[PDB]
Structures are given as structure tokens and as C-alpha cells.
Symmetry: D2
């Protein structure tokens, strides 16, 4: 069991961006910018910084060229600069390795703390970030499949109850979960910002990052992503969907980037910000928890997930 | 080969209605009225007459109580009363069994001809029909999954080239087809009213009726049918979809009625009314002809189709 | 009264394209291509040929540089090459000036007849046209406000009853009209292709062209055109809408090009192809005939309409 | 001018419900339930309690029969039971009249504090509420115009800067405002829950309630409300829209209930939960601040607003 620290938890606002290592930067740019339409805040021959339509911070996704495709960091923004010090004290009390950089790990982020969390994931906590043009009314740039916000991460770990306790002490609130008759948690969705989730834990060999997710404004935007991929003759990169998830009630689509990192695009959220928001518990034997309409099962969705890196940049051993 | 008659073909306007035999009239009414929202023109203890949101003729679907679920008649409306006489002469020259009723076979239809066509299908041709209130602006009745028009039938027959020639002689124009390397037709979509099709021929044991199709105004209406079925806990009746078909470019959904009759709901059409409308030919080995996005294959869609009846009510032998 | 010729009417398929004279080709190209997204079939320093997303004939709109902006031709495609000879005989019997060009008046069109019709409008009838790539499944090109088909023209003329008879003799069928209590027609919508209309006659000084109309697949496409114009700071070119018309039941938007030519973009049509389609008559005093939702009246929509040219290229006197 | 109390402010979660006095309960029920589709949590001969599709607290709207239509209370939910005590101490310090009921003022709410606030408005603060079935996946009940969440109130007051300082002290954060060249605030939108706003202050004679607003999932839901009102021949109750507001970027509609209370239905929000969310300041001369598309001005929207009641149930004098 991971103990609850005496030190106070940092006040986490929301998931904010992911840094993914990619192997061929130009092929990754073709996918994220030309196919998906994300906006380039900054790029060079080593990295591409991308943001969604409604974002004002510098980026939601950093693509970094490297040797092995993997998640390098899943970042959460905290409420105040002092919260980065709180995160540092917190994870040092849990006995985790931490690295602090007053001027950031990537461009457009200031004082930041990266840690190898108890579950083996590279989390980053930061407050300072370069504000850029919020594109929410730039309808002259709006694409038929526009990604409007980054919403959440989904993590694969072997012991979900152990991880759930740790995230709950960190302040995440479970909105939905999947349990058996004994009441054991098999998967949990948890939030800070008032939507179904900022991250989710699902059981399996780990640490691995199952996906990063963006939303669209409407369902037709998701359908357009599928239609565009079929016209580009890359429909084999659509993994699962479109469908409706029972858990989260999202209309979803999962596609695969050039290094096989899985990106979820979905639409339809509901408000979870009240402190007594009713947790929805789904039975592990209820098929509708996975697909409200009964869509056939896609096996790779249960077997494949991205490697994650430690603070030296090496792949974390998968347990 | 089915020879081209010397007698002129009747001028067919469009597919107009289907008469389906159902085994439990109340369970069938629950599906077509309470779940799908079709409008009741007339009903009694033996039949239910239903129409779509934009129809003005009496009905698009007649549900008739009977012991063996089957297609009883696929009806096409013709341009003038005289075309019913043309249809009769035409089919008599082809040597087919015909039955003429000056007052119709079903309520709301006048002078009508039913025939056992060369492929074993019970086609009806009629001009006279009772006009009813066109509900196209009755937004106070509009449901979130509203079926707005009946569009086509899809037939399963063993020799598609044979049937294609016969329907082309009858005046249908092929808009899209599926061919092998040698140029042989494996399936064809054919129209009279200016959309992709009024009927289609696909290969398989037959005669059998694969489905009858209705359209919605937009894609979200089809998604709402799926969501409503999930909330009613009848998602097991969603057979295939939603997806995008390559052939016809339709956004589709296939569901099953209580007698397993397959109903397609789709949206998005294109104009095919010019005489030199470009026929689109898909190769028999191109998967995108089936699913533009790559959705997995649903086996029952290729094995199951409805029985059809002859003019005496007996099931037509499936060759 | 315009007499019905003894000569047979040409069999008209549908409205097919308009040739608009524009004063600044560059500004016009920016509006039609960069803002509205129409596709270029051909262009040079004097003309731009544009087509909609689902079109296969060479174009739906020809922009021709000229000194005075005006409609140069409203073109209808006929069923066969011989219908062009029929059209020539028909209009000569009516005593109208005609001009025949075996090789066409504009690129992409073959043998064509242009006439100064009985109401003073420049109609063109043609069959031959260069086919081009039908872009209906080119989702990699699809814009959030995509215009998918050309649908109709709308003409302003002083005596609607006089013109309505002439168009009925030509084969157009009235689907909807506006009448007073005496039964007198004030405006009428008429079709050949099976939608609400290919052209409409409204009362006013004429001949003038009120607008040319394109459709989108769904309502959100029209809202996006308005949003994009707002982002480009050209919202002052949105003249009327979005709204719902009572007559035609269309969800509409009217915008103004650089020369003030009015373009309608709408969605939602219904089928009118049966010969006894029920004509919908709206009373002159029913305000919902104009706006189903009661949207405020825009005066310019009732006072402004485009000039039209005679066969010498000079503006027709407006009566 | 309104001092910042020494007492800590109650932690406000979000606007949660409004209690409106109506003169004819049956006519009001027809509008809110039969026309708009809100869900009944409880009703009797004197009151109707209604909730939106995704709500889990007892209600979002209470209609209470009375002699003079007016706002009886605008209620905000607080984070903990102790926050109701904080609210009482805070308003006592401000010198405002307050009334505390340990068992609530309306059914379904527990301990609650109502106050006549400094701007003359009847605010309620509560934590305890009866949870009910959250209907967010009840697609069997989903209407084509479904109202999914309660989002905000909009208040009219004579001195917006004075009210803005009081609300900022209470913890609301301004996301957008309208200012003149001197920097003086004319209108402000402010939030607690992370959307553009929970309430807004606009300048005019007051106190009056301009409107209460609900959202829909997508734009087509708002279009359907207009369409249904046109079919029910109550289009004259559509006051303004549909349109796109520059301030808030919302796709909006304003309609009037039987007592002329204004209801806004809109869709599209963006995230404002970060503490340094960029405030968007619109200039008082920028017409796009009101309508992004340039929709004409509707005079009544600037002159009419609902009366509000004091704690004795009598109308507050309007300054």
C-alpha cells in the first residue's frame, strides 16, 4: 500500500500536455498536423510543439525525436508556483526519484518537477507556461475534424486498487469505476477539472500509457476524421470506433500514430465538479460498460499500449 | 438470359413501400413505432400501415400478421395509371405469373399488379394511392432519430448479371457496381428516382430480401437510434454499424426487427439523375467498398436475409 | 399570355450552372474559393470555372471578368443532344432571339443554345459537357463549410402568373406557391429534378436574378460559413439568416459576393418527383411562409437583385 | 464601495437552480415540460420542480404559483455544509438581510440561506440536496431539443463596476468583459465552475433578472427548438437568435416563457478553470461582441428583464 504523505498534496488543476518520443519527426508531423489538424506553437528539427483549438497555454503535445517511441512525460498543471514545491516535497516523502528544473524541461514551460511516480510513470507538475493565441474563435482555421481540447490520459498498471488509493490521496476524485462482486476495483476514472477524468487506471502489464485523448465539439467532427483517413488510404490506422462507451458516456474513436501511440478523439462530457458527484460503478460482466451499442471487440485495444521512460530517458521495465 | 420484351416497360418512379409479414403484431409495433418512431397511417388487429416523416402517399411499410415472417411484396410506384397496364403486359411477355386487383392488395393503394418476377421476387406496380398528411414540417412530432424517407430495397439472388440485364431493360440505371478482374458484375446498385438506388442486387442464395432502407436527415439521428437502443437494452438488435459504405458513400446502420427482418437507416446521398451519370466500379477485392473506415466484418450480414413469398403466400424456394 | 408552342419542349434535367460577370476576378476568386471552398475546374486571367463537392460535369459556376456585374447565363442541362435542337425550335416558335454554338459559349460545355427568353432572362440549354473528377468521397479536401451541390436559381419578374404558365409549358412542375384569397399566384417554386425547385419566380421589377443556391450536407456546415465569415471580419456580407423558410422547408443562409450577387446556401430538401406531388399553397398573409421562426425582415432581400445580360452582353432593361 | 468582509467567503461551486414565480402553473408546465422537455422531479398544484438531462441534484428550476411573475431566488451550491454558515456570516457582515432555514425553502433542498444581496438580488446558498436519477444515458427519454445542463444566470444592475468588485471578493473570476477606451467595465461574465460564467452583470435599471440559461449537447438541438416552436405556432415567443455571440463564443437562442421570463438555450463552452485564464476584453464599439455574424439588434433584449422578489415575496424596487 502506498502511504498517504504528511506533506500536503499539490493542488492539481488538470492534465495539460504529454511529451511523446517519436522516431521519425516528419512522419509524425504529417499525422498530427496534416491529418489531424493540431496547431503548431513552435517547431524545429528536434521537436514539434502542438496545441488544440481552444488552448491558451503553450502546448498540449510535444513530439520529441528519439530512439525508442515512448511516453516521456504526462504533465499536470498545478494551481500556483508554490504547488510545484509541494509536489516536490510530496514525492520525496513517497521516496520517488525527482528532478527539478527552474527553467523547464521543454520550451514554453517554466519551473517544473518531473518524477518517477510510485506506479512507474513519468509525471510532470508545473505552473509557469508561455501563454499563446487562444484559437477558439479562429473559424478561418477550423477544420471539419477539429480537435478542440486535450482531455485526459489513460494508464495501464498491474494493481489498480494500489494506484487508485495513491491518486485519491493526491486529490483525484473517482467519477466511474468497474468492480466485481467482492467490490474490487478493476479500472477507475478520476478527475480534477470537472469532467469524467484527467487520468484513468486500467489493469494490465505496466507501466504503459494506453492513450492520450482530445475532444471535438460535435459528433460529426469525429466522423469526419474517419472519412478523411479513408480518403487518405490510412483507414488501417483507425483501431476502434466510432462507438459509445458505457463508462464515461463518450462518443469515441481510437487511432494510431506512426509509432503506434494511441490517440483517442471523443465528444460529450458531463459535469463532475460537485464534491458528492455520484460515482457510477459498472459490473465487470456488463458488456455495455465497454460498448453501449455492442460494437465488436478489437483485440489490440486490450494488448497494446505505449512504453514509458524513466528520468534518464530509458524505457521503464514492464511489470 | 432474360429477353428484352417488345412491350414497353412501365415508367417506374421509385421504390414506394414494402409489405412484411410479421408474427407478433404488437411486438413488431413496439419496434417500428415506439423504438423507431415511424408514423401510423392506419392500423387494426391484422395490419399496421406506417409512413416516414416526409411521405405523402399512404404508407411506406405495411406490417401484416402471418405465421411465417417474410417479404410479401416490394412495391414500386409508376408514373401514370396506364403504366400498370404496361407492367402487366411486360411481365406477361416475360412469362411471369401476374395478379391484378383493381381495388388493390392493401389499404391505401388502388389499381395494382403483383408479379412473381424472373428472379422469384414479389414485385408490385401501382399508381393510385391515398394521399395523407405530409409530416415534413411537423417538428412537434420529430424524434431525435427521425426516419424521413423510404429509400431502397436490397435483393439477394444467385445470378447477378442475369438480374442486372433484366432490371436495366426495365429502366433502372446502374450507379455503382462491384466487378472482378474480368469485368463480371458481382453486385449492382440501380435507380429510377435519382439517388444511388431504388433497389440493389447482391449475390447469394435466393430469392431473399436482404433489407429495406430509410434515411435520416443527418448523421446524429442515426447515432441517436443506437443510443436509444442501448438505453432500452436492445443493443443486441444492432447488427452492423455505424459505418461509412464505400459503395453509395452512405453513413449506415443495420438493425433487426422482432422477426429478424433487417432494416438499414442511413444518411447522405448524391444526385444520379443525369443519363450519363458516371458509374462507379469497385473491385471485388477492395475492402473499402464495404467499409470506408475498415470496420470489422459482421458475419450474419452475409449469411442472413429474409424469405420472400409467392402470390399464394408460400415461401419461395431458395436456390 | 405566352402561347404554348406546337414544337415539343426540350426535356430539361436540372439547373446545372450559372455564368456571372464579375468586376474584379481576384476578389471574386477569394470569396468563392478561399472563403466558400468551391473547387477549381479551370482558370485563367479572365475566368474561373468552379464546381461543388459532388459534381461530375465540368462546372456549376463560371466567373467571367466584365465591366458590369450581372448574370450572363443560367444554364439547364437537357437529357439528350437532340434536346438542344428541340430547345432551339421551341424558342424560335416563341419568337425569341437565340444563338447556337456547336462548341459552346464557355469551356467545358459543348453544343449549346443560349436564348433571351420571354421574361428577358438569358437561359442556356446544353447536353455535352466535359466530365471531371467527382469529389464526393474526397474527404481529404472537405471543408467545414463544404458546398456539395448546386440546386437552383431564383428569378425576379413583374408578372408571375404569365411566367408560371410559360415554365409549366416547358415542363417545370410547381411544388409550392404563394397565393392570395382570390387564388392569384404571387410567387412559385418549380422543378424538374425532384427537389423543391430548379428555378422560382418571385414578383418584382425584372428581369433580375435574385440568387443562385448551393446546398451543404448538414446544418452545422452553414453555421460554419457564418462563423468563418465572422472570423474573417466579413460578417457584413451575411445578408439574411440563418433561418428556416416556411416555403421549401429549407434551413438557409444568404450572403453577398464582391459584386453584390446573392448566393444562398441551404440544407434539407424533400422529394417532389411523383407527378401528383401535393402542391403546397401558402397564403400571402402567412408570415411563416417567409420565416418559420419569425426572424426579422431584411429589407435588402426584397429590393436588391442582380442585373442580367442580353445576347450582346448588355444589361437587359429592367421593367 | 462594497467592502471586502473580514469573514471568509463561502466556497461556491456553481449556479444550481432558479425559483421563478409564474402566474398560471398549467401554462408554464406546458412551456417547460411539453415544449422544452425538462424532467419533472416533483409537482403538485402549487409548484413544479424540473431538472435537465444530466443533473443529479433535485432540480435546476422551481416554478411557483404566485400573483406577480418574478425571480424568487437564484441559488448557488456551496462546497460543504459549513459553507452555508460562512455565507451567513459573510452577508451579515455586509449588512444584508438574511433568512436561514435548516430544512430548506423548497423541496429537495436541505439547510439553506437566502439573502437580499447588495445589488438587491435574492441569492440562495445551500449544500444539502436530495439526489435523483441522473438521466444522462437515458436516451429512451432524449428529445431532439434536449436541455442537458443549467449553466448560468445573467443579472441587470445600474453599476456594474460596483457589482463586479463584490462578486470578485466572493470568489467569482471574470472570464470576459466589455470595456470602453478608459478601461471602465460595462458588462462582465464571471465563473466558479470552469465555464465562461455562472452569472454575469450587465448595465441597466435593476435589480432585474435578464435570463436563466441551459445548454444543449449540439447546435442541431437548438435549431430543433426553433423548428418545434414554429410547428406549434408559438414562434412569436422566440425573441432573439439563433446566432453566435462574440462574448462567450456561444451559439445561442433566447425564448420567452408565458410570464415573459427569458430563457437562453446555448451550446459550446470553453474551459476557464486555470487561475490565470486570459480575460477577454471586448471594446464597447465592437459590434461583434454582441453578434459574431452581425444579426440585427432585437430592442426588447435590451429593455425587458424579470422583476426579482425580496424575502417577503414582494417585488424589489427597480433603480
Amino acid at each position: 500500500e502506498i502511504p498517504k504523505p504528511v506533506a500536503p498534496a499539490p493542488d492539481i488543476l488538470r492534465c495539460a500536455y504529454a511529451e511523446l518520443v517519436v522516431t521519425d519527426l516528419a512522419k509524425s508531423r504529417n499525422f498530427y498536423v496534416d491529418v489531424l489538424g493540431l496547431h503548431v506553437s513552435y517547431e524545429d528539427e528536434n521537436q514539434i510543439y502542438l496545441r488544440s483549438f481552444e488552448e491558451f497555454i503553450h502546448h498540449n503535445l510535444v513530439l520529441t525525436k528519439g530512439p525508442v517511441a515512448a511516453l516521456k512525460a504526462m504533465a499536470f498543471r498545478v494551481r500556483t508556483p508554490e504547488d510545484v514545491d509541494k509536489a516536490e516535497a510530496y514525492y520525496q516523502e513517497l521516496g520517488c526519484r525527482t528532478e527539478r528544473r527552474k527553467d523547464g524541461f521543454v520550451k514554453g514551460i517554466g519551473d517544473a518537477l518531473r518524477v518517477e511516480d510510485p506506479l512507474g510513470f513519468p509525471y510532470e507538475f508545473f505552473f509557469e507556461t508561455t501563454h499563446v493565441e487562444r484559437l477558439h474563435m479562429r473559424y478561418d482555421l477550423y477544420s471539419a475534424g477539429e480537435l478542440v481540447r486535450l482531455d485526459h490520459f489513460n494508464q495501464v498498471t498491474p494493481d489498480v486498487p494500489r494506484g487508485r488509493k495513491y491518486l485519491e490521496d493526491l486529490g483525484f476524485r473517482v467519477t466511474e469505476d468497474i468492480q466485481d462482486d467482492e467490490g474490487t476495483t478493476y479500472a477507475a476514472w478520476m478527475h480534477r477539472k470537472g469532467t469524467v477524468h484527467d487520468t484513468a487506471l486500467t489493469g494490465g502489464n505496466g507501466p504503459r500509457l494506453h492513450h492520450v485523448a482530445f475532444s471535438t465539439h460535435e459528433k460529426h467532427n469525429i466522423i469526419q476524421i474517419c472519412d478523411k483517413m479513408g480518403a487518405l488510404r490510412i483507414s488501417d490506422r483507425i483501431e476502434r470506433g466510432p462507438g459509445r462507451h458505457g463508462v464515461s458516456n463518450a462518443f469515441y474513436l481510437y487511432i494510431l500514430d506512426p509509432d503506434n501511440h494511441r490517440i483517442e478523439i471523443y465528444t460529450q462530457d458531463y459535469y463532475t465538479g460537485d464534491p458528492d458527484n455520484p460515482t457510477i460503478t459498472w459490473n465487470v460482466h456488463d458488456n455495455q460498460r465497454r460498448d453501449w451499442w455492442g460494437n465488436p471487440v478489437v483485440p489490440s485495444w486490450y494488448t497494446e499500449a505505449s512504453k514509458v521512460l524513466d528520468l534518464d530517458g530509458n524505457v521503464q521495465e514492464i511489470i
